[PDB]
Amino acid sequence: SGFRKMAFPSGKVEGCMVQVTCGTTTLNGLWLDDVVYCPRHVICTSEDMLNPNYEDLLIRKSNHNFLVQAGNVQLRVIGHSMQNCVLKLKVDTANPKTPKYKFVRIQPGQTFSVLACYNGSPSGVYQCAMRPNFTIKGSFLNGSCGSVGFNIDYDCVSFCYMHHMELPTGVHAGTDLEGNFYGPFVDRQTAQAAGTDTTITVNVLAWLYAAVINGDRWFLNRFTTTLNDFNLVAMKYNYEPLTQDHVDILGPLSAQTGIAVLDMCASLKELLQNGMNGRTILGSALLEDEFTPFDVVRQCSGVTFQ
Amino acid sequence: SGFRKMAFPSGKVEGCMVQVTCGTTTLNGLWLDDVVYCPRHVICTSEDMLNPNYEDLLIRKSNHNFLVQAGNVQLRVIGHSMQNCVLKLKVDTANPKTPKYKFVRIQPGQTFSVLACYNGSPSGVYQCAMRPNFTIKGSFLNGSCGSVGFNIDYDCVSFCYMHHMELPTGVHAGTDLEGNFYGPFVDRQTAQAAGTDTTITVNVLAWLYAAVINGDRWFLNRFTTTLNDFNLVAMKYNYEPLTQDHVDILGPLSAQTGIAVLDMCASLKELLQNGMNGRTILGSALLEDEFTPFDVVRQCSGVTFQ
Numbered sequence: 182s183g184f185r186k187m188a189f190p191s192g193k194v195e196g197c198m199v200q201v202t203c204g205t206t207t208l209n210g211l212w213l214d215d216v217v218y219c220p221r222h223v224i225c226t227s228e229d230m231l232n233p234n235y236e237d238l239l240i241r242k243s244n245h246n247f248l249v250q251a252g253n254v255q256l257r258v259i260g261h262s263m264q265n266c267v268l269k270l271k272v273d274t275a276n277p278k279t280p281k282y283k284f285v286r287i288q289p290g291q292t293f294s295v296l297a298c299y300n301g302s303p304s305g306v307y308q309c310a311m312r313p314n315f316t317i318k319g320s321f322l323n324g325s326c327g328s329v330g331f332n333i334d335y336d337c338v339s340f341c342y343m344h345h346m347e348l349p350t351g352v353h354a355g356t357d358l359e360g361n362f363y364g365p366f367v368d369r370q371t372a373q374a375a376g377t378d379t380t381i382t383v384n385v386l387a388w389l390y391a392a393v394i395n396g397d398r399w400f401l402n403r404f405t406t407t408l409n410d411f412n413l414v415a416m417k418y419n420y421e422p423l424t425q426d427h428v429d430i431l432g433p434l435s436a437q438t439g440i441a442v443l444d445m446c447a448s449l450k451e452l453l454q455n456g457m458n459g460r461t462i463l464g465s466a467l468l469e470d471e472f473t474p475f476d477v478v479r480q481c482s483g484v485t486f487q
Numbered sequence: 488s489g490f491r492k493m494a495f496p497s498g499k500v501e502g503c504m505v506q507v508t509c510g511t512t513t514l515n516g517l518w519l520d521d522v523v524y525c526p527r528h529v530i531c532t533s534e535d536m537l538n539p540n541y542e543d544l545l546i547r548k549s550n551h552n553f554l555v556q557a558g559n560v561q562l563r564v565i566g567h568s569m570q571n572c573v574l575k576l577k578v579d580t581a582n583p584k585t586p587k588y589k590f591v592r593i594q595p596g597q598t599f600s601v602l603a604c605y606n607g608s609p610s611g612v613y614q615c616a617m618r619p620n621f622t623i624k625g626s627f628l629n630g631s632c633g634s635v636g637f638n639i640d641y642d643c644v645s646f647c648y649m650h651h652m653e654l655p656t657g658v659h660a661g662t663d664l665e666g667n668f669y670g671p672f673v674d675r676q677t678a679q680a681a682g683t684d685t686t687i688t689v690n691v692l693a694w695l696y697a698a699v700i701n702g703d704r705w706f707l708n709r710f711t712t713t714l715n716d717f718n719l720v721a722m723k724y725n726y727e728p729l730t731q732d733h734v735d736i737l738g739p740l741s742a743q744t745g746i747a748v749l750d751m752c753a754s755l756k757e758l759l760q761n762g763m764n765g766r767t768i769l770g771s772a773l774l775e776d777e778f779t780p781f782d783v784v785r786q787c788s789g790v791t792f793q
C-alpha cells in the first residue's frame with residue numbers, strides 16, 4: 182500500500198536527450214532515429230525573442246550553425262526544417278537508443294512524467310498534470326527548454342510535451358511534439374498570462390478512491406447525491422463538471438471499493454462545504470487533482486513496463 | 488521556477504534490475520558486476536516466514552534453485568551467500584550496464600529516489616525520506632521486495648535502500664545494501680510496529696526557503712527568536728530539535744534569500760502556533776518535511792547528472 186506522486190522510469194527517454202547549441206543559446210533536444218527535435222526559439226538571440234519572424238530567421242541559418250552534442254560525441258547536422266514551433270534537425274546518425282515511441286497530444290486533466298534536463302543532461306523526473314487552462318505546474322529553470330513530458334505504455338514512449346517557457350505566475354507552457362502549443366500561448370516574450378484554472382473533478386474523485394483503498398475512510402458518509410445536484414456544487418467551488426463518462430471511468434474504482442460514484446460525490450460535496458476540519462487524506466490537507474483514474478489503478482494494482 | 492517532489496533519473500538503476508525466483512517466491516534483484524542482491528526472505532515460503540532460521544534454510548538450497556531473469560535472458564547462478572538480511576547470488580555474467588556505484592547508509596532526514604519494481608520490471612519512480620523512526624512512506628505492493636532506493640552524484644549511484652516489508656500502518660521498512668535493517672525491524676512476520684515519528688525540522692525550514700525563492704512570502708515576519716526558544720516550541724509540536732549544524736547547513740539558503748535562519752524559525756513558530764489560516768505554501772496546506780537543504784538547492788539551481 183501507500184500512494185505517491187509516481188513518475189514513469191525515465192531511462193528510455195534519458196537515452197534520447199542531447200544538447201543543442203546555436204549562437205549563444207543552448208537547450209535540450211530529443212534525438213529519435215536520425216532527427217533531433219528542439220524548440221525553434223533556439224535560433225533566436227536576446228533581441229530576437231521580442232517579436233521574431235522565425236521563417237525569416239531560419240532561412241539565414243546553416244546546418245553548421247547547429248552544434249548537437251550527444252554526451253561527449255558531436256552529431257553532424259545534415260538538414261533542418263521547422264514544424265510549427267519545433268525545429269527538426271536532421272543528423273547523420275540514427276540514435277541506437279531510440280525506443281518505440283509515438284507523438285500523442287494529451288487532454289487537460291491527463292498526467293505525464295517530465296524529465297527535466299539541462300545541457301542535454303537529465304536532472305530529475307517528476308509527475309505533472311495538464312491543467313484545464315493548458316499550463317502545467319512544473320519545475321524548470323534557465324536552459325530547461327526542450328525537456329519533454331511523456332507516458333509509457335508497456336515498451337512504447339508516448340511523447341506528449343516539449344517545454345518552451347515560463348508564464349508570470351510561475352507555471353509552464355509548451356507544445357506537443359509536432360510543435361503545436363498547448364493553450365493560447367506563443368513562443369515570443371509578450372505579456373501572456375495563464376488564464377483562470379479549475380480543479381479536475383474526476384481526478385479528485387479518483388484520489389478519494391485511492392485514499393479508501395489505502396484506509397482513509399473518515400470522509401465517507403451514508404448520504405448520496407444526483408449528478409446534477411453535485412454539479413451545482415462543483416460549479417460554485419470552481420470544480421469542473423462531472424460527466425456520465427467520468428462516472429463510467431470511475432466504475433472499476435467504485436467496484437473495487439464498493440462505494441458508488443455518486444456516493445463519493447456526496448463525500449466530495451461535504452468536503453467542499455466544510456473543509457477537512459484539521460484532518461488529512463493520503464498525507465494531504467488539500468483535495469488533490471493530479472491523479473487520473475488510470476494513475477490510481479496503476480499504483481494501487483502494480484502495472485509495470487518493459 | 489516551481490518546486491516538485493523530484494526523483495533522480497532512474498535509467499542507471501533500471502539496467503540493474505532483474506527477477507529472482509526461488510520456489511514459489513518471485514521478487515526483484517539488483518545486478519551489479521557478477522552479483523545479484525536480493526532480500527533473503529526469497530528462500531522462504533508461506534510457513535517459512537513465521538519464525539525462520541535463514542542459515543538453516545540456506546544450507547538446504549542449491550545454486551540451481553535460484554532462477555534469475557535479466558529481461559528475457561536467464562542468468563546462471565554459480566554461487567550464493569548470505570550477508571545479513573540480503574542474499575548475494577554469484578552469477579556467471581557481469582552486468583554490462585553496471586554503473587559506477589557505492590553502497591551508502593543514509594541518516595533519518597535524508598531523501599532518496601525509489602525505483603518500484605515488479606517481476607524485475609521497473610514500474611515507477613518517486614522520492615522518499617527516511618523518517619526519524621527509520622520507516623519510509625513508500626508505495627509498494629506484493630512482489631515489490633528488492634526494489635532499491637538510491638541517490639545519484641554526478642555519474643555514481645549511491646544505493647542506500649532495499650525494500651523488504653510493509654508495517655501495519657502502511658509504511659515500509661528495509662535494509663541498506665549490506666543487509667542491515669534501518670530501524671528495529673526484522674524480516675519475519677511478527678507484530679512489529681513503526682514507533683512514534685517526528686517532523687524533520689531542518690527540512691521544513693529548507694522548504695520554507697524554497698517557498699520564498701518561489702515567491703510565497705506571506706508567512707514571513709519581522710520577529711526573530713533564539714535557537715533555544717525555538718527548540719522549546721519544536722518539542723511541543725513534536726518537531727525534532729534544531730542544531731547549530733542545521734543552522735550552518737541552511738546558510739546558503741539564508742544567504743540567497745536574505746532571511747536569517749533564526750528569522751525563518753520565528754516564521755515556523757508562528758505557523759505552528761496559528762496554523763496557516765486557509766493559505767498554502769508551494770501548493771501544500773501542510774508544512775512539508777521531505778525536502779533536504781540539498782534537495783532545495785539542487786532544484787532551485789539546476790544541478791544535473793551524467
Ligand SMILES: *C(=N)[C@H](C[C@@H]1CCNC1=O)NC(=O)[C@@H]1[C@@H]2[C@H](CN1C(=O)[C@@H](NC(=O)C(F)(F)F)C(C)(C)C)C2(C)C
Binds near residue numbers: 230
Ligand atoms: C528555455 N530554456 C526557457 C525556460 C524558462 C526559463 C525559466 N523557466 C523556464 O521554464 N524558456 C524561455 O526562456 C522562454 C523563451 C523566451 C522567453 N521565455 C520565457 O520563458 C519567458 N516567459 C515569457 O516570455 C512568457 F511569460 F511570455 F511566457 C521568461 C520571462 C524568461 C520566463 C521565449 C522564446 C518565450
Ligand SMILES: *C(=N)[C@H](C[C@@H]1CCNC1=O)NC(=O)[C@@H]1[C@@H]2[C@H](CN1C(=O)[C@@H](NC(=O)C(F)(F)F)C(C)(C)C)C2(C)C
Binds near residue numbers: 182536627655
Ligand atoms: C515483498 N515483496 C513484500 C512487500 C510487501 C507486500 C505488501 N507491501 C509490501 O511492501 N514483503 C513481504 O511480504 C514481507 C515478507 C514477509 C511478510 N512481509 C510483509 O511485508 C508483511 N509485514 C510484516 O510481516 C510486518 F508487519 F511485520 F512488517 C505483510 C503483513 C505481508 C505486509 C516478510 C519476510 C517480512
